[PDB]
Amino acid sequence: VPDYHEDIHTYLREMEVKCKPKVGYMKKQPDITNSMRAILVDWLVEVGEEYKLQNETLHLAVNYIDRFLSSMSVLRGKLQLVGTAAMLLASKFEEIYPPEVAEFVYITDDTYTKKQVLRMEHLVLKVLTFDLAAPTVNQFLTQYFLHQQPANCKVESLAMFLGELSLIDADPYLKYLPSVIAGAAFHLALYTVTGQSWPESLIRKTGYTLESLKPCLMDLHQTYLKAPQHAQQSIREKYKNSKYHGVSLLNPPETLNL
Amino acid sequence: MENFQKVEKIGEGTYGVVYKARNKLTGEVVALKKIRLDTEGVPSTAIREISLLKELNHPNIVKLLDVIHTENKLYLVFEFLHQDLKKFMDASALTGIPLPLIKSYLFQLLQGLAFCHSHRVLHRDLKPQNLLINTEGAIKLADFGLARAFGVPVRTYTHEVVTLWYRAPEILLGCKYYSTAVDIWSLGCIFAEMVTRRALFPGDSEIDQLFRIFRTLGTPDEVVWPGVTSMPDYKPSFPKWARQDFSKVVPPLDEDGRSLLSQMLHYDPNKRISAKAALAHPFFQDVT
Ligand SMILES: CC(C)c1[nH]nc2c(NCc3ccc(-c4ccccn4)cc3)nc(SCCN)nc12
Ligand SMILES: [Br-]
Numbered sequence: 001v002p003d004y005h006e007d008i009h010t011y012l013r014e015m016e017v018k019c020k021p022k023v024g025y026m027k028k029q030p031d032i033t034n035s036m037r038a039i040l041v042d043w044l045v046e047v048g049e050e051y052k053l054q055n056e057t058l059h060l061a062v063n064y065i066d067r068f069l070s071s072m073s074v075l076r077g078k079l080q081l082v083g084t085a086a087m088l089l090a091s092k093f094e095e096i097y098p099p100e101v102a103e104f105v106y107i108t109d110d111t112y113t114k115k116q117v118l119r120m121e122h123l124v125l126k127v128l129t130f131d132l133a134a135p136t137v138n139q140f141l142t143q144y145f146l147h148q149q150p151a152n153c154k155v156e157s158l159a160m161f162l163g164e165l166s167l168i169d170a171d172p173y174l175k176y177l178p179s180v181i182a183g184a185a186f187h188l189a190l191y192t193v194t195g196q197s198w199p200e201s202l203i204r205k206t207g208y209t210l211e212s213l214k215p216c217l218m219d220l221h222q223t224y225l226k227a228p229q230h231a232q233q234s235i236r237e238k239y240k241n242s243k244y245h246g247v248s249l250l251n252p253p254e255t256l257n258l
Numbered sequence: 259m260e261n262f263q264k265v266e267k268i269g270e271g272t273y274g275v276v277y278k279a280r281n282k283l284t285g286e287v288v289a290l291k292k293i294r295l296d297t298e299g300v301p302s303t304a305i306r307e308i309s310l311l312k313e314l315n316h317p318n319i320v321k322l323l324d325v326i327h328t329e330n331k332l333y334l335v336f337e338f339l340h341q342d343l344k345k346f347m348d349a350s351a352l353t354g355i356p357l358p359l360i361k362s363y364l365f366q367l368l369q370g371l372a373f374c375h376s377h378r379v380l381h382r383d384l385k386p387q388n389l390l391i392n393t394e395g396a397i398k399l400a401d402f403g404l405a406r407a408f409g410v411p412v413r414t415y416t417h418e419v420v421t422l423w424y425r426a427p428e429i430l431l432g433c434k435y436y437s438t439a440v441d442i443w444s445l446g447c448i449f450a451e452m453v454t455r456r457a458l459f460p461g462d463s464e465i466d467q468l469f470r471i472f473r474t475l476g477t478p479d480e481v482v483w484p485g486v487t488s489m490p491d492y493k494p495s496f497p498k499w500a501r502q503d504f505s506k507v508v509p510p511l512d513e514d515g516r517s518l519l520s521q522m523l524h525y526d527p528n529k530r531i532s533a534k535a536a537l538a539h540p541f542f543q544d545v546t
């Protein structure tokens with residue numbers, strides 16, 4: 001473990017409550033649906049693969065979209081402009097070499113101009129009040145991985161796969177904090193591969209029992225079982241790659257006995 | 259922006275130009291950091307400085323007061339502090355700075371730094387020009403344009419980081435990973451610099467930088483830093499200098515100050531002391 005592993009964990013805990021978006025915001029959006037958000041997020045997974053962006057960059061972009069749509073109404077034909085600016089900002093925050101604006105414009109097939117993307121950027125910054133350093137599922141997972149005894153690369157990839165699936169479906173995952181989804185994703189991955197359970201040292205560090213994780217786990221297990229049928233498939237196709245040891249082809253257990 | 263009267267340019271830093279200005283309504287003297295926006299939109303340095311400094315509320319970190327997007331420009335409004343550490347050291351280049359003031363300043367910078375680190379932020383440009391002193395005796399970290407939110411554990415980050423004189427050997431020798439230890443190295447150099455009023459390692463290239471480090475601390479090998487001779491930019495033709503005794507290098511320092519400085523300037527990043535552990539060092543026994 002590195003020097004501040006506990007101080008950082010405690011702080012990320014405090015920040016995730018402040019950076020959380022409104023649980024029911026899509027009900028109040030007159031013109032967009034959860035299904036349109038799923039199509040947007042799944043497209044950004046493709047963009048991430050195409051430009052070789054980090055998984056952290058994708059998780060941040062989604063957090064910016066959810067916080068932006070919690071306070072602004074958006075028409076369907078402008079939803080992809082929101083996502084594009086969000087991805088641009090996430091990349092400038094997190095990446096060593098962000099793609100350029102001109103490239104982000106190109107991947108929308110000239111639906112929007114460069115000027116629109118830079119103005120949407122200003123708007124997103126203003127609406128989010130420049131607070132970009134949000135805790136993600138990814139940041140929690142990588143800390144949780146330091147408690148594996150011993151490390152198992154199949155567990156780590158499967159847990160990343162499940163974490164990333166949760167970005168697609170606002171209902172239900174908007175009702176959970178990132179640290180909870182990461183705990184559910186880690187336990188489910190661990191159980192699928194080795195048959196072991198959410199370990200004692202993580203209960204100690206997180207204050208979460210399996211019991212506290214159970215509602216999210218019930219939700220995540222259903223997401224996992226139904227993933228081959230999902231209208232959106234970019235994440236699944238991505239975790240077929242050998243880089244992620246083909247974990248998206250593994251069979252989910254039939255029950256969790258919880 | 260109509261509320262501000264520019265008084266004068268006071269410096270540059272990582273990105274943009276910095277001005278002293280006066281709020282016309284409240285009378286408050288501020289510092290304005292200007293970015294012109296004219297191609298990639300808002301620079302990543304600005305996006306990062308702003309998001310991070312909004313979280314970093316601490317008495318030894320400079321306070322961000324406001325962000326104003328005017329017509330083609332971005333202005334960051336900051337508290338103004340009357341002096342930087344570099345100028346303060348130049349004006350004391352003959353008398354010296356009394357060791358208890360050095361101790362206090364170091365203690366305060368370490369508090370600011372431990373805060374950043376416990377809040378997952380690397381500064382990556384600690385040098386005396388970016389350390390600001392107010393009329394009260396407070397010192398504060400500034401210019402977070404090169405800073406970055408880091409993960410647990412870290413990945414690979416930008417290689418071209420930290421002003422040369424303050425840059426850690428693990429960056430210079432090309433390690434794949436670096437972390438909180440790069441900031442502590444910088445502070446070690448600054449600690450030494452307050453004592454002697456001259457930069458500890460003033461190199462004029464990357465190789466010359468290493469050589470200045472080696473001459474003083476001894477040329478690292480596998481005894482002191484396991485893995486060093488395998489590092490990307492390590493060369494078997496590096497000269498082998500012996501390490502110098504600290505009571506010649508920083509004579510005013512007492513026993514405890516020598517021990518602390520040693521621990522901040524360890525070659526191996528895994529041996530180098532953290533900011534929080536440094537605050538507990540016996541050297542800070544009798545700190546004001
Ligand atoms: C932007 C914000 C973080 C900030 N707040 N106070 C700042 C400050 N105060 C020192 C100073 C004061 C007046 C002068 C001065 C006064 C008159 C004429 C010329 N210069 C110089 C430095 N300096 C700088 S940048 C120069 C140092 N590397 N940034 C500052
Ligand atoms: Br006025």
Ligand SMILES: [Cl-]
Binds near residue numbers: 453454509510
């Ligand atoms: Cl001296």
